[PDB]
Amino acid sequence: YLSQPRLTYKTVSGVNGPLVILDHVKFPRYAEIVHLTLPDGTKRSGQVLEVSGSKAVVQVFEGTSGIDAKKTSCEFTGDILRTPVSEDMLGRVFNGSGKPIDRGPVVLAEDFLDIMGQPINPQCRIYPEEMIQTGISAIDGMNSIARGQKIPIFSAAGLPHNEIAAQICRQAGLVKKENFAIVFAAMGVNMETARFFKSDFEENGSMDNVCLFLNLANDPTIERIITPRLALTTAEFLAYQCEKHVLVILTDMSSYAEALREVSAAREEVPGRRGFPGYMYTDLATIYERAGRVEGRNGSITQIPILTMPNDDITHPIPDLTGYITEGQIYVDRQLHNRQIYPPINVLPSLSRLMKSAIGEGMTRKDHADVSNQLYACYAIGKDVQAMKAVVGEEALTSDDLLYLEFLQKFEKNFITQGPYENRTVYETLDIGWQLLRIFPKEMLKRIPQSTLSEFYPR
Amino acid sequence: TFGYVHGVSGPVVTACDMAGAAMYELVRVGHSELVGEIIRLEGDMATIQVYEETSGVSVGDPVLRTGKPLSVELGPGIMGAIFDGIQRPLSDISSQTQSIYIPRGVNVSALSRDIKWEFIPSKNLRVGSHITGGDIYGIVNENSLIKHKIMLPPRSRGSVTYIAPPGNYDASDVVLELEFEGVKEKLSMVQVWPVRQVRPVTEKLPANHPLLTGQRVLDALFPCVQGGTTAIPGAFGCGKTVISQSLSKYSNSDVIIYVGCGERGNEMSEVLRDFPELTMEVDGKVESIMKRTALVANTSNMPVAAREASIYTGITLSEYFRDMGYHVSMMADSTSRWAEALREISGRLAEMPADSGYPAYLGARLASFYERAGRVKCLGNPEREGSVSIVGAVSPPGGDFSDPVTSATLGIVQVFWGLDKKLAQRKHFPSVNWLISYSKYMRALDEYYDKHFTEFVPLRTKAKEILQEEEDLAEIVQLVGKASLAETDKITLEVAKLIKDDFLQQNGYTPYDRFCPFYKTVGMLSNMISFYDMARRAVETTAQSDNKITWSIIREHMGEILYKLSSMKFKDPVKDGEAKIKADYAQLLEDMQNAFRSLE
Amino acid sequence: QAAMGSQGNLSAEVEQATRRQVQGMQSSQQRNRERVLTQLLGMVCDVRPQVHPNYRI
């Protein structure tokens, strides 16, 4: 606590777009939170971005319209933005500023954390082990998410990245061969989609384990920047202090990146590559890397950042800088979507670098690794045979080629195509895999050891 | 020694009343003592770049000026510790706080001052004797492997006025006192050296002694030399673990330094978890690798100054032991991660970008990095010698070689151990591409090889010729099926396979193949090439008419010889001594020549 | 009709559990209500004036 009376200033040097420049401010802090009172009694929030002597420069969260240089007062809190956190806030819905928008009370805090936090000391970081099943076969039997990795979903604009994200929140959980929570943050979301998330989470009973942050497209752009920090700040409290596993989903990081560029312009910084700040790399790492396991504690944080690829070009700095510091990718395609496949996830370009540790005896099932590798080869071959068929015709194909075409057609129809309300656990996903693999005789399943085939292949 | 904060514009803090400050000096800003550096100066004001978050810094906060620029603290206790890129012990921060986070403004001394080290003077020095820079005046006994030699700091000299007696001293005591021109300097066991400065040596020598790694491939065909510089691609599927473990476990170097630059959190954990579990036989005892290793850990979310400085912190630690007469092998986990950190700082400073957005001086910084490696004659009267090798990895976005960072690196390093992912998918390890990889030290090592082994050089020449021809024949085989093909080409194809299978391929998870001594590597290749020549002669000298030798005849006739050649890799050096393995290889050579002799 | 009833009666059961939880909170906070209030009044009554730490004169 400070127990120091706050100072309120009526001295304003000028106002320039989103910024208000104050004067005669006593020992101002950088990143200090202040509150403005306009002549009409309207209150606004803001944050100090520059303090050059007594000339404090504050960015106003809301619009600066209506602010004068004679009557507007600025109340200083004497501190920076610290988020009230508790276990009870799980099951609540908040806006970007951390305020409730679910008609519930303000959070009754157990502590206050600096939302910027600190990096996790690498000496106490534990390599990812067990798996967190998502319920979506395309990313459980092919590229599973290890309990501690960070694997993004890259999508083009217009693809159902928000519907999949909502499905993961409803279905995700532990393998279960009470301590699992999901923190969901949507940045720059439009009103129709924001309603979708809120209503879909409430109706299906999942809300008890979801902490939802909604930053709407028409909300202040600076609030969009702290939104993912508040989500992770909660995740760190829940995960590391309350000994539980937290799945954090950061939706539309591309909208975050645009908000970050806006803040950079407010500081009159010269834009870097493709208009983005030269520090975009470390800023994404600052958010992304606040995850993983820690020594001596049973909690964990995983992340599934979701990013829209501008112009569907994976080379763009946003997916490029993200992927360069994440472990593999899910990758949602367009061809599968136009073919009316849901989920439209393309297994050939996807990768989960930690899958080798996520799956196996004692974590999922003995045959997990073998089924995945054989299915991947079979799908890749089926696509190759399909390309051949288009040139040589059906009569030019042999029996083995026909089996690969049968697999290809049934793989997409049975294994990848799921529906938004069918929850397929890791064991059902593997059983579906075997149903497709039993299309082939044993001798064609070259990537599955004979011991595995004898145990699982028949029946 | 204090100034005051005048203002904050983000990560940049302007100080006032800071007239007595040098550029690239160090400051501790605010009541949390935030680490930063002074870049621009004007009047009695200074512009400070703060590495950590500046939230909460007030106008009027104190700024503590530290006279030394970014420097590495060097002394006993350096071994076995894991450091941040700016030399902050992570194993002490996590253990003195009971936290999982690195505290903001954390201030833990690089070397603990609560350890009473066993120090033995040289026993050759006396009060009144003359000592110069680089001289060794006593040794600290750290562990069973590495003796930590205490040197007089460079750029210091004079007459010795006090020598501490043998005993237990910590890093805060006074061990040696010397007076130069009436000025008395009190030295402890710890010296400080600016990280951007190159530690002086008496002379820089040519690198002639091989780096004796345990792999048959990446040695016989693509040698590295102590003091040399190489590059290794770093891709998920390349199998880089094989080189890291083989180099750190069994190398003939004395000290291993592993440098992270700014990798994924989980990747840093994998290195930190694997390394402590690695062991090697030394004097017949199994010792932990961490007793002769030092590691610098930096994740992608570490302060950019540390990620950029990490690479120079590592090599400064490397040179420190180089000056002791040790052979040091440093691996930079990803120099692409470093280059990214460097570009970020240039961006923050609003410098004009050059090639692909990188700073104009990218090449100059890389060139001066690698130039610091090499075999040297050390400073100090002990007339000792040592070396630093660099085996830094490159991982450009997209896997392309057009990125200035990989292109510049390849124009600097003399050896490239190009790895591939296709080989890993085929389960062929180590995953060496062969056609892309090269070594430019082959000439430098010709003196060593001629002196000690003689036949090695023509063997490696023939081996590369066979492998290249196998590739050259690929189009002929594809269009022919080995039907309309010369018998001499069939020898090349099938023998090249033998080489690829039972020589260049090595299985490090087997106890007999963990490490292949060079004498075994050259033994294996000698017999395979001798077979090649005998098979070529058997066909060529009989290929005229009437009664000719073909590969089908050779293969069927002496199949036991081809088997014995394949079996050669199973000669376990731990149980079968040098004389026994050579004796068995000699027997195969004789049996082999006689097998062909029976055909003529 | 049975489905609407059964967990519908459980809606009263939802209400039944809710009332019990509120009563619990009311009982718990009473046990030391005066102690928490007393400490708060002490903290506000003790002013502890201080000059800003960056004052330099």
Side-chain angles (χ1 to χ4, degrees), chain A, chain B, chain C residues 2-3 5 8 11-57:
Chain A
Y1 66 86
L2 300 175
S3 299
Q4 299 292 335
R6 294 177 177 174
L7 280 64
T8 299
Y9 300 74
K10 295 182 179 179
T11 300
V12 180
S13 180
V15 184
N16 184 30
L19 304 177
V20 178
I21 300 170
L22 304 175
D23 200 354
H24 301 168
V25 177
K26 307 298 184 181
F27 302 97
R29 294 178 188 273
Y30 167 77
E32 187 174 0
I33 302 301
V34 300
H35 299 262
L36 305 179
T37 301
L38 278 65
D40 62 0
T42 298
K43 295 182 180 180
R44 300 181 192 275
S45 297
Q47 181 174 46
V48 177
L49 274 61
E50 183 177 359
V51 292
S52 179
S54 65
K55 301 294 186 293
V57 180
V58 58
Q59 182 178 38
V60 177
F61 288 2
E62 300 85 353
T64 57
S65 176
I67 297 170
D68 66 32
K70 184 174 179 180
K71 295 181 180 179
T72 302
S73 63
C74 180
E75 178 179 329
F76 290 70
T77 64
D79 210 329
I80 61 168
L81 180 62
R82 296 176 182 273
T83 297
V85 298
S86 67
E87 192 179 30
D88 289 344
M89 73 183 289
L90 182 65
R92 306 292 306 279
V93 179
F94 305 99
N95 62 12
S97 67
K99 301 296 185 182
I101 58 170
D102 57 14
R103 300 180 63 201
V106 69
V107 174
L108 183 63
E110 294 167 51
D111 211 331
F112 296 94
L113 301 175
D114 180 350
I115 67 169
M116 292 307 293
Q118 298 86 42
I120 296 169
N121 186 320
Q123 190 270 330
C124 64
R125 182 180 293 277
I126 303 300
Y127 195 74
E129 288 179 343
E130 294 181 53
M131 188 187 83
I132 301 172
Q133 69 182 328
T134 61
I136 298 168
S137 293
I139 60 170
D140 287 340
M142 297 297 285
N143 294 279
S144 68
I145 300 171
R147 185 178 299 172
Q149 77 173 107
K150 298 181 286 292
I151 178 163
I153 301 171
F154 293 120
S155 65
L159 299 177
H161 70 285
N162 288 334
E163 296 75 3
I164 292 167
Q167 183 177 339
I168 292 167
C169 290
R170 286 186 280 103
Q171 298 181 329
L174 304 180
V175 172
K176 299 183 181 179
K177 295 181 284 185
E178 70 276 16
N179 63 341
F180 179 77
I182 300 170
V183 179
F184 190 90
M187 285 77 71
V189 65
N190 57 26
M191 189 69 249
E192 292 295 297
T193 300
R195 186 181 299 107
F196 166 69
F197 284 124
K198 183 179 188 294
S199 293
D200 188 55
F201 289 2
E202 291 174 4
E203 290 178 354
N204 289 278
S206 67
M207 188 62 75
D208 285 347
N209 292 303
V210 177
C211 183
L212 176 65
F213 296 86
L214 300 175
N215 170 272
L216 277 64
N218 61 332
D219 282 334
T221 60
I222 193 65
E223 291 179 354
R224 193 174 310 160
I225 299 301
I226 66 171
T227 297
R229 276 72 179 272
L230 271 60
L232 291 173
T233 300
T234 299
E236 287 181 339
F237 177 79
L238 293 172
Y240 298 135
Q241 293 189 32
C242 298
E243 297 292 295
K244 62 175 76 180
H245 307 287
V246 178
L247 172 65
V248 179
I249 299 166
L250 305 174
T251 299
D252 291 317
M253 291 301 293
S254 295
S255 294
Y256 174 93
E258 289 184 358
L260 182 61
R261 185 161 60 195
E262 189 276 331
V263 172
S264 178
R267 293 183 182 279
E268 298 189 344
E269 295 169 349
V270 176
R273 296 290 302 278
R274 304 292 299 275
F276 290 94
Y279 51 85
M280 184 177 178
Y281 175 80
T282 191
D283 192 70
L284 290 170
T286 299
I287 294 169
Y288 290 152
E289 296 295 322
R290 295 173 72 173
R293 295 179 66 190
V294 298
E295 185 177 58
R297 310 193 188 195
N298 292 313
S300 69
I301 300 171
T302 62
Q303 295 192 6
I304 307 170
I306 301 171
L307 306 94
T308 299
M309 298 178 283
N311 203 34
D312 199 25
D313 184 353
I314 198 71
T315 301
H316 187 281
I318 292 166
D320 184 60
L321 292 173
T322 298
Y324 189 53
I325 58 170
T326 64
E327 297 180 295
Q329 63 181 12
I330 301 301
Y331 186 80
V332 177
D333 209 328
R334 185 178 296 278
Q335 182 179 38
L336 294 169
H337 182 70
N338 286 357
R339 293 170 64 204
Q340 307 304 292
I341 295 164
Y342 178 102
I345 298 165
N346 187 334
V347 300
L348 291 173
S350 68
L351 181 67
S352 177
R353 291 177 66 192
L354 276 294
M355 184 176 179
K356 68 182 182 181
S357 296
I359 63 170
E361 181 67 49
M363 292 179 183
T364 58
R365 201 163 77 185
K366 175 178 169 184
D367 54 332
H368 201 150
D370 290 344
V371 172
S372 178
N373 287 339
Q374 186 63 51
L375 290 172
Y376 184 99
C378 290
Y379 186 76
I381 293 166
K383 291 291 289 184
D384 187 79
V385 173
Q386 183 178 67
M388 184 65 75
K389 182 178 178 180
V391 175
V392 301
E394 184 175 359
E395 297 82 358
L397 303 176
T398 190
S399 294
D400 292 345
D401 288 344
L402 294 171
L403 291 172
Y404 288 121
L405 292 172
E406 181 178 358
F407 177 100
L408 179 62
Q409 185 64 51
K410 289 177 174 174
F411 178 79
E412 291 176 327
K413 184 175 180 180
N414 293 333
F415 181 78
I416 299 300
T417 303
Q418 188 163 326
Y421 298 119
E422 183 178 66
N423 185 333
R424 297 181 182 182
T425 63
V426 68
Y427 298 117
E428 183 175 358
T429 296
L430 291 173
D431 288 347
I432 292 167
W434 276 114
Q435 289 175 350
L436 293 174
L437 293 171
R438 291 164 183 154
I439 291 168
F440 296 96
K442 289 178 181 178
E443 296 81 1
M444 294 177 70
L445 302 177
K446 291 180 180 178
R447 292 181 181 274
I448 300 171
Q450 294 85 343
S451 295
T452 298
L453 290 171
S454 294
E455 184 172 355
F456 296 96
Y457 179 89
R459 294 181 183 274
Chain B
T1 60
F2 283 93
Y4 299 92
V5 176
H6 184 70
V8 179
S9 59
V12 178
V13 178
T14 299
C16 65
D17 297 312
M18 184 64 72
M23 186 174 179
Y24 299 148
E25 193 163 4
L26 300 175
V27 297
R28 305 299 295 268
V29 177
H31 297 281
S32 65
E33 299 184 295
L34 296 174
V35 176
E37 63 182 58
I38 298 170
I39 298 171
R40 185 174 183 274
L41 294 95
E42 183 177 359
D44 58 339
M45 297 180 71
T47 299
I48 299 165
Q49 179 68 53
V50 177
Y51 302 166
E52 297 181 354
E53 293 291 351
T54 59
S55 296
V57 174
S58 65
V59 175
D61 276 351
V63 180
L64 177 64
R65 185 177 66 252
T66 298
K68 300 294 185 182
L70 184 66
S71 65
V72 178
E73 184 172 345
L74 303 169
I78 193 65
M79 296 304 290
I82 299 88
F83 293 92
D84 192 354
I86 58 169
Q87 192 70 5
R88 297 191 295 188
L90 294 175
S91 67
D92 294 289
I93 292 168
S94 68
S95 64
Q96 295 179 2
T97 63
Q98 307 302 308
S99 178
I100 62 168
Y101 294 95
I102 300 169
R104 194 181 295 159
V106 66
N107 192 34
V108 177
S109 296
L111 307 172
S112 176
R113 310 305 173 85
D114 63 2
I115 299 166
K116 302 295 184 182
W117 292 101
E118 183 181 359
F119 176 78
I120 304 298
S122 69
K123 301 184 182 179
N124 294 323
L125 297 171
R126 301 291 186 275
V127 173
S129 67
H130 295 138
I131 187 166
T132 190
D135 281 348
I136 299 168
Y137 51 88
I139 299 170
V140 176
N141 183 29
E142 287 190 336
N143 62 40
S144 67
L145 302 179
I146 304 299
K147 294 181 177 66
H148 187 99
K149 302 179 195 178
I150 305 300
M151 302 168 284
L152 187 69
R155 305 179 183 174
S156 179
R157 72 291 203 196
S159 175
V160 176
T161 62
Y162 169 82
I163 302 167
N168 297 317
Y169 303 93
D170 61 54
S172 296
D173 212 330
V174 178
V175 175
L176 183 141
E177 297 180 354
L178 72 161
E179 182 178 299
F180 183 77
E181 298 182 354
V183 179
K184 184 176 180 179
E185 181 178 27
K186 295 181 180 179
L187 300 176
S188 70
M189 292 187 286
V190 178
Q191 64 180 256
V192 178
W193 180 263
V195 74
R196 298 284 184 77
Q197 296 292 307
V198 178
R199 291 180 66 92
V201 300
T202 299
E203 183 61 288
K204 190 171 180 171
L205 307 177
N208 298 108
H209 188 303
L211 178 64
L212 302 174
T213 63
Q215 300 296 333
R216 289 186 289 275
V217 68
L218 304 179
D219 183 21
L221 275 61
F222 302 118
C224 182
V225 63
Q226 291 182 320
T229 59
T230 190
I232 304 94
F236 177 54
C238 68
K240 68 175 182 174
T241 299
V242 171
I243 293 167
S244 179
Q245 290 181 337
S246 295
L247 182 62
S248 67
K249 289 174 69 176
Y250 302 119
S251 174
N252 61 318
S253 67
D254 301 296
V255 178
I256 304 299
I257 297 170
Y258 190 97
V259 179
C261 300
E263 297 84 55
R264 301 167 181 84
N266 289 332
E267 291 178 298
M268 192 68 258
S269 180
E270 182 178 359
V271 173
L272 293 171
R273 183 177 65 82
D274 192 54
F275 263 86
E277 299 297 324
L278 306 176
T279 65
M280 66 280 160
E281 299 83 355
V282 178
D283 293 315
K285 182 174 176 177
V286 178
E287 291 279 16
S288 175
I289 194 64
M290 293 301 292
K291 289 184 180 182
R292 70 185 193 89
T293 300
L295 191 143
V296 179
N298 295 283
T299 63
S300 67
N301 65 340
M302 297 297 289
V304 69
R307 289 189 274 115
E308 192 273 332
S310 180
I311 197 67
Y312 295 112
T313 298
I315 200 165
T316 299
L317 294 169
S318 180
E319 290 177 354
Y320 178 55
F321 287 96
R322 181 204 67 192
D323 289 344
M324 295 180 184
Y326 291 120
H327 297 280
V328 179
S329 177
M330 181 177 71
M331 179 177 287
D333 194 354
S334 177
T335 61
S336 294
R337 294 292 186 186
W338 175 84
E340 186 73 36
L342 181 61
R343 183 169 69 187
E344 181 180 331
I345 292 166
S346 179
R348 288 181 182 276
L349 299 175
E351 292 181 342
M352 184 180 72
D355 291 314
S356 299
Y358 291 96
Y361 46 82
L362 176 64
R365 296 288 179 87
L366 290 168
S368 67
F369 176 55
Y370 288 97
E371 187 65 21
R372 291 172 74 163
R375 176 191 169 215
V376 302
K377 182 183 283 185
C378 297
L379 300 177
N381 65 57
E383 298 291 338
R384 63 193 181 274
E385 297 189 0
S387 69
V388 176
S389 297
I390 300 171
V391 294
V394 296
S395 187
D400 194 6
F401 290 97
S402 67
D403 185 290
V405 174
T406 300
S407 180
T409 299
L410 291 172
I412 297 169
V413 302
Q414 299 299 286
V415 178
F416 183 50
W417 287 342
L419 302 176
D420 200 331
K421 296 188 287 186
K422 294 190 286 294
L423 289 166
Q425 292 172 345
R426 293 166 61 196
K427 309 296 184 183
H428 182 282
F429 302 99
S431 298
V432 179
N433 181 266
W434 294 317
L435 295 172
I436 294 169
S437 297
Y438 64 90
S439 175
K440 295 181 182 295
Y441 293 120
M442 291 175 70
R443 298 281 81 77
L445 298 176
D446 278 349
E447 182 178 359
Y448 177 79
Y449 289 123
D450 186 69
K451 182 177 179 180
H452 296 263
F453 300 97
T454 300
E455 69 183 358
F456 171 74
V457 171
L459 290 171
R460 68 177 176 178
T461 299
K462 288 177 176 176
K464 290 180 180 179
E465 291 172 353
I466 293 166
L467 185 151
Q468 181 62 49
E469 290 177 354
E470 189 276 331
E471 182 64 21
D472 291 347
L473 295 168
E475 291 178 354
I476 292 167
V477 172
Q478 290 167 347
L479 301 174
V480 175
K482 301 184 182 178
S484 297
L485 179 67
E487 291 301 315
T488 58
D489 292 340
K490 289 178 184 175
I491 292 167
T492 298
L493 291 172
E494 293 297 322
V495 172
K497 185 177 189 294
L498 176 64
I499 292 168
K500 290 179 180 178
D501 287 343
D502 294 314
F503 180 76
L504 297 169
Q505 186 175 219
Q506 188 167 340
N507 184 334
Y509 299 102
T510 60
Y512 65 87
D513 218 20
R514 290 178 291 153
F515 181 99
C516 182
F518 181 100
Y519 79 84
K520 177 175 171 176
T521 300
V522 72
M524 290 173 70
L525 184 59
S526 180
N527 287 357
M528 291 179 183
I529 298 300
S530 294
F531 177 101
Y532 177 79
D533 284 346
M534 290 299 292
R536 283 282 301 273
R537 184 177 178 84
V539 174
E540 290 177 354
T541 61
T542 62
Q544 305 83 353
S545 67
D546 292 347
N547 184 30
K548 63 182 183 180
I549 297 169
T550 66
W551 181 240
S552 294
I553 292 168
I554 292 166
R555 181 181 63 79
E556 185 65 21
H557 181 71
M558 64 185 74
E560 294 79 1
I561 297 300
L562 291 171
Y563 177 79
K564 289 179 180 179
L565 289 170
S566 294
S567 72
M568 291 176 71
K569 67 192 182 191
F570 292 96
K571 300 294 183 181
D572 183 2
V574 173
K575 297 185 280 291
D576 290 338
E578 294 81 0
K580 182 176 176 185
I581 293 169
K582 289 179 180 178
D584 286 350
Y585 287 1
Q587 187 66 52
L588 269 57
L589 179 62
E590 183 177 359
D591 288 350
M592 182 278 290
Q593 291 177 333
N594 286 334
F596 286 97
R597 183 180 63 81
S598 67
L599 296 174
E600 296 180 85
Chain C
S11 87
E13 301 167 27
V14 173
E15 291 297 322
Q16 291 164 0
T18 301
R19 289 194 296 272
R20 289 197 298 272
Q21 292 173 355
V22 172
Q23 291 168 348
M25 291 178 183
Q26 291 170 347
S27 180
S28 180
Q29 67 89 36
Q30 186 62 54
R31 288 183 290 169
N32 58 11
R33 182 181 178 88
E34 184 64 21
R35 184 177 181 275
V36 173
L37 185 152
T38 298
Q39 184 177 339
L40 180 61
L41 269 297
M43 290 189 287
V44 72
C45 291
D46 187 3
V47 174
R48 301 184 184 181
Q50 184 176 8
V51 175
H52 192 286
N54 291 356
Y55 186 76
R56 296 290 184 276
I57 300 292

